[PDB]
Amino acid sequence: SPTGLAGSLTNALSNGLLSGGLLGILENLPLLDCLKGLLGKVTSVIPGLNNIIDIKVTDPQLLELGLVQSPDGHRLYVTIPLGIKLQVNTPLVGASLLRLAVKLDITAEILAVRDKQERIHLVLGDCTHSPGSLQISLLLPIQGLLDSLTGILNKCLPELVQGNVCPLVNEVLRGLDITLVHDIVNMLIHGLQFVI
Predict the structure, then answer these.
(1) Rounded to 5 degrees, what are φ and ψ at 27?
(2) CATH code (residue 117)
(3) The domain containing residue 137 runs over which residues?
(4) Residue 137 β-bridge partners
(5) How many domains does the chain have?
(6) Closest to 125 measured CA to CA, from 111, 114, 113, 141
(7) C-alpha to C-alpha distance for 76 and 124, rounded to whole angstroms
(8) Distance of CA 5 to the CA centre of its chain
(9) Between which residues do disulfide bridges form?
(10) CB 3.0–4.6 Å: which of 42, 82, 109, 167 could bond 125 by disulfide?
């Protein structure tokens, strides 16, 4: 159904994000990089035996976007709610240790800026993980390992999602429908409010 800019922008973004192979990106997040003591050297030095930890990611999720327009009408902030499942494993004995639910929000800032030669550009300014949005939740005295783990995932990972997802956001933005972009730009640059 046809609608104003705010709601057009919302679906255009969802669609691009999905079609641009988000979900895939979320499913291939290099999580074992959140782990890089020397008890790791011991496993890597006994041939025929390694990695007593592994993390496969499952069930990527994009929830519905969210839109806010700055008070001076010059700025948009998109909220991008994400969700993954985490299965913590150990190849050595071969059984699941933890299955975890993780939710998280990226927010992208959208700007119009008039250049040098009287052109206007639609730009992705800031694009961060949203502080306070990281939320782990559990699905054998694992709690020693749970609180060590969910602790680790708290500065590593939001910066990891951010780094993997924002470039896609950058891409979906530029690839947007030309008239939609042209309309958005001219409302943002003139402070005209459309988001509601």
Answers:
(1) -80, -20
(2) 3.15.10.10
(3) 1-196
(4) 101
(5) 1
(6) 111
(7) 10
(8) 24
(9) 127-166
(10) 109
